Design an enzyme around this catalytic site. Structure first.
Site, mmCIF file in Angstrom:
data_model
loop_
_atom_site.group_PDB
_atom_site.id
_atom_site.type_symbol
_atom_site.label_atom_id
_atom_site.label_comp_id
_atom_site.label_asym_id
_atom_site.label_seq_id
_atom_site.Cartn_x
_atom_site.Cartn_y
_atom_site.Cartn_z
ATOM 1 N N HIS A 132 82.615 129.937 174.940
ATOM 2 C CA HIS A 132 82.863 131.147 175.452
ATOM 3 C C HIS A 132 81.502 131.855 174.930
ATOM 4 O O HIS A 132 80.982 131.831 174.062
ATOM 5 C CB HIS A 132 84.005 131.674 174.614
ATOM 6 N N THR B 127 76.102 89.976 162.788
ATOM 7 C CA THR B 127 75.678 91.315 163.504
ATOM 8 C C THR B 127 74.005 91.422 163.836
ATOM 9 O O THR B 127 73.671 91.865 164.999
ATOM 10 C CB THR B 127 76.274 92.668 163.008
ATOM 11 N N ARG C 278 83.802 136.476 184.584
ATOM 12 C CA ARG C 278 83.376 136.053 183.429
ATOM 13 C C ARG C 278 82.286 135.025 183.365
ATOM 14 O O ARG C 278 82.301 134.557 184.602
ATOM 15 C CB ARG C 278 84.649 135.480 182.524
ATOM 16 N N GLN D 242 90.425 124.096 184.614
ATOM 17 C CA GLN D 242 91.306 123.091 185.143
ATOM 18 C C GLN D 242 91.258 123.083 186.650
ATOM 19 O O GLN D 242 91.229 121.823 187.219
ATOM 20 C CB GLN D 242 92.739 123.510 184.710
ATOM 21 N N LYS E 150 77.446 95.106 166.215
ATOM 22 C CA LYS E 150 76.248 95.832 165.934
ATOM 23 C C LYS E 150 76.141 97.131 166.629
ATOM 24 O O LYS E 150 76.253 97.132 168.038
ATOM 25 C CB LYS E 150 74.958 95.035 166.203
HETATM 26 O O1 LIG Z 1 79.462 91.870 155.633
HETATM 27 C C1 LIG Z 1 78.750 91.308 156.879
HETATM 28 N N1 LIG Z 1 79.552 91.158 157.797
HETATM 29 C C2 LIG Z 1 79.044 90.647 159.077
HETATM 30 O O2 LIG Z 1 79.846 90.520 160.039
HETATM 31 C C3 LIG Z 1 77.433 90.711 159.010
HETATM 32 N N2 LIG Z 1 76.746 90.137 160.106
HETATM 33 N N3 LIG Z 1 75.376 90.239 159.378
HETATM 34 N N4 LIG Z 1 75.620 90.697 158.042
HETATM 35 C C4 LIG Z 1 76.905 90.760 157.836
HETATM 36 N N5 LIG Z 1 77.434 91.330 156.693
HETATM 37 O O1 LIG Z 2 89.717 128.181 182.204
HETATM 38 C C1 LIG Z 2 90.232 128.305 181.191
HETATM 39 N N1 LIG Z 2 91.312 127.666 180.921
HETATM 40 C C2 LIG Z 2 92.276 127.844 179.954
HETATM 41 O O2 LIG Z 2 93.362 127.169 179.420
HETATM 42 C C3 LIG Z 2 91.732 129.080 179.088
HETATM 43 N N2 LIG Z 2 92.631 129.317 177.966
HETATM 44 N N3 LIG Z 2 91.947 130.515 177.797
HETATM 45 N N4 LIG Z 2 90.966 130.727 178.372
HETATM 46 C C4 LIG Z 2 90.805 129.678 179.472
HETATM 47 N N5 LIG Z 2 90.036 129.523 180.306
#
Ligand SMILES: O=c1[nH]c(=O)c2nn[nH]c2[nH]1
Ligand SMILES: O=c1[nH]c(=O)c2nn[nH]c2[nH]1
Ligand SMILES: O=c1[nH]c(=O)c2nn[nH]c2[nH]1
Ligand SMILES: O=c1[nH]c(=O)c2nn[nH]c2[nH]1
Ligand code: NA
Ligand code: NA
Ligand code: NA
Ligand code: NA
Lengths: 295, 295, 295, 295
Positions: free
Chosen positions: D256, D57, D176, D228, D10
């Protein structure tokens, strides 16, 4: 401390390309969003302010446009292979290029039942994607996918027989709505380089078409026992239709649609066989995943 | 201080409905998002904590589901008229109901070239909407729209002849990309109540179809002088095809696609007649609006 | 057909400005998103492809940057008044300018308990906004607001005494969670032009501060009878603290938090006075609005 | 075909919890979004419609609420360890639990300079996250992070000395703007189970505090040679301040801010030392990543 891994580049590069048939006058458009991340002998940029090893991300961006100008941008598998190969071959110290492409839909319009030569509609937000990893001395690894394919069936989905204990309140059902957003990924056998990728170019559009087709048909026709059971059938079939694929991955949310008991209102019957009006639930959602390969 | 205006209700009510033909077995689905805001003799809730005048928003929500259970939910013009009429007739002190409906696409899938009885695809994020205002003693005011209709033409758009002064840098062009997201609204003649709205039910789907059709055809075929010029042609035509409409409004962003000069790279030619690769611009964007009525 | 209304311009213009104190070395940053829509004698652009009346949206964009370069960008009330006044005075045929500004937060960081001279944090997504309408011969109309101010109180909210009929299922409560996203708007007395707007410049930041302060204190301390009752108290107080305001508008969603009955699990008590764990509901949501003026 | 990997559960489970001091009357709130994915002996659900192996789920969702009712939900490292341990111990055939938690900010308000006992503000959209992997026979693997921490410095960023070739157009700069959204991840030494995780509970909030503090101070005070270089300094320091961490990962976009040449307008000077007004660029963006460990 020490650098254990490092990659950098340019993300969210939007790119449009048009092809204009000088003969027919038919134009065709392509639009993508491109990300290119590089790895290699770049640690000193991080540890000693040595920017000599950095191909600026702005130059990466220019290179994406330049490569799109000089080469086909379709199929995206090819374009990303050309782009990653460019960086590892151009730059002695760059040893891997990770290229992600999101292809946007621009479907030619039909006006008065006939295809228009230069007008297009985003007929859906579904995307076609590739993840292309070009690694020096390790060939080219491509994962292709479709995503954002949103579907619903109003019946012919079931879910019963699941584990029941003190934490369980879900009722078994023999008839429910099933809706999801399809994220489907097929992983290609390793390619030795650009010549091999080129040699299989037709299979990329064919295989995307197949995956989509199998996904939709299986979804529509499977009297589904679960999301798990239905997605496996999809993956199996795709595997059986394209031998150059090694695995198929699905990631599927169960976008729940809840019945609404209105019996409290003038005895209204809106549940079970009488269910007409439902409450789509935005969250939470089941999330079902699997990777299927060859036995 | 004094209350000068007040409205309250329930927003973002998701609603699904299915119709099941017991004969053919064909099922059809509808999904919307509904907002209902009420006005009337409710000021004391604000000024003196008098909640007796409040129809709880939770009850408004239940009422939306109950009304969808008891009535057609299509066309949305009808459903919203039924829903707003319910509140002003049920509650003596509620004098207006403002209903907004967003209809989501669930298009029947074709599997193997044939329509599936119960499987659907969100073929696009385009919406069909209504704004229905039910006002006691003032009938029913409906505005219908389509929105999120995303389109592009790669040629046959121009923009030249605009004002030029010391603030102007834009170059005139005789050939450019035009892309937009269509927001089109047709405003209906006042309706005296639910019987009149019902009496015109067929015109709602017909007129939506027309607006969409005119929008797409005009966009595709107009050798556009500007967004302004093209949208007016759309509005005109819709007005000429449905006499019960009083005005047509368009709100259109100009989603710019910029040329990229690559001449700095090995003399590459990518501008003017040689333009192939473009940079789609996320922001900013021109925004062009107009409301067209009858002369 | 005829043009009944028309406006056009540039939307989503991002603008940053820095002020650098040459003395202290303290720098200050401002960042906004600006939209400017113009109206006037522009119908012929729509009806006859006459682009001579169009100030291109690209020039509008340049003009926004140029005006920000030449003038203070704070308070936004002033900046938008300067910008709208520019267009109606520069262009004889432009008779109204509609300017919307969204101000983004860049709050100076404290490092080691002391304010940094040039480093900033987006401490929240709350915005400060203005809507400035400059209309030839009608002065300057300003609406100021704060939005995206997200708050929650875990107790000291009630809701009981509301209408109950066959559509009602909500239980009365004497103790509930209240959470909302505050959208608060104060509308200024008409200003005759830029000199009067300038003459009141201090009141704009003061009054924003007040509205925010009153909003938060009233929310925190009111043992709330309803959202309706609490927002009116907020509006009243702001009206009583700044005489140049004519009305105060609130738009407040009720972001519901539902109790979860776990009694089905080993008799767990999680409701009423025993409620600890709740399910926040993304949708739907009550929506409560009011405009308060002077008696 | 064969199942090669499979997990399900889920996602997007929203959870609120309140603590009420019966003494002081001070209340405290916690709000998260929880995802739990399970793996184990579940393949038959996929290959043979065997739902007996599926913990629905919906039951997973109930279990999340039940566990939050019965246990502290803070620090999230602990809560996720308790939750994943529950599933692998309760269900013989479930062998791994992957738990992701997003913690939302609810900061106590100060009203009139004093902390309010039950009113809170979302002071920012920054999140505190955990990824807890509970694997049978492999202990508990925790990755902690902060994300959405948006910052800007207006000066004291440089970028020069980078590779220049035929693809390069970027100008070197000695002054910059640097702005980013900080995504920082510290990976904990493997824990043998819940007792060890519990034994280190204080270090989780301490270490989050440190990472945040180091991030902000280094950002503010480093006369940055590159993104970097600056992020490595951040990672180093965090590593030196908490020995139970094995690696620190940063993922930083370069958001940028472009200079705007206005020289074309009355000779206006807005570049280099005269730059006041800039154009923030939504896309594209450099993306800079690194994982730093112990030498
Ligand atoms: O198709 C489904 N699979 C599941 O694992 C499930 N669990 N609840 N409802 C569901 N429906
Ligand atoms: O900080 C930066 N790293 C990069 O790799 C880069 N390439 N263009 N501008 C940049 N500025
Ligand atoms: O404060 C509230 N106002 C309302 O109008 C309402 N309706 N349901 N719950 C509510 N709470
Ligand atoms: O069609 C257009 N209309 C306009 O008003 C405009 N301004 N710049 N580009 C434009 N294109
Ligand atoms: Na290389
Ligand atoms: Na009434
Ligand atoms: Na004028
Ligand atoms: Na187990």
């Amino acid at each position: 401390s020490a650098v254990k891994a490092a990659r950098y580049g340019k993300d969210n590069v939007r790119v449009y390309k048009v092809h204009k048939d000088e003969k027919t006058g038919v134009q065709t458009v392509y639009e993508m969003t491109v990300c290119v991340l590089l790895e290699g002998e770049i640690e000193t940029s991080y540890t000693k302010a040595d920017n000599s090893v950095i191909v600026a991300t702005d130059s990466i961006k220019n290179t994406i446009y330049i490569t799109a100008k000089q080469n086909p941008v379709t199929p995206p598998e090819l374009f990303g292979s050309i782009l990653g190969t460019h960086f590892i071959e151009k730059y002695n110290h760059i040893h891997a290029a990770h290229v992600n492409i999101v292809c946007h839909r621009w479907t030619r319009m039909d006006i008065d039942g006939k295809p228009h030569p230069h007008s297009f509609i985003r007929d859906s937000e579904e995307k076609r994607n590739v993840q292309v990893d070009v690694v020096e001395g390790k060939g080219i690894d491509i994962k292709s996918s479709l995503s954002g394919l949103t579907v619903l069936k109003s019946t012919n989905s079931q879910f019963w027989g699941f584990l029941r204990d003190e934490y369980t309140t879900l009722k078994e059902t023999w008839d429910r709505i099933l809706s999801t957003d399809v994220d489907a990924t097929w992983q290609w056998k390793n390619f030795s380089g650009l010549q091999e990728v080129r040699s299989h170019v037709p299979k990329f559009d064919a295989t995307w078409a197949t995956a989509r087709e199998v996904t939709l048909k299986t979804f529509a026709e499977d009297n589904s026992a679960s999301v798990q059971a239905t997605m496996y059938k999809m993956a199996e079939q795709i595997l059986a239709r394209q031998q150059l694929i090694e695995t198929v991955e699905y990631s599927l949310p169960n976008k729940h649609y809840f019945e609404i008991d209105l019996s409290w209102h003038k005895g209204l019957q809106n549940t079970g066989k009488n269910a007409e009006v439902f409450a789509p639930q935005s969250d939470p959602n089941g999330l079902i995943k699997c990777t299927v390969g060859r036995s």
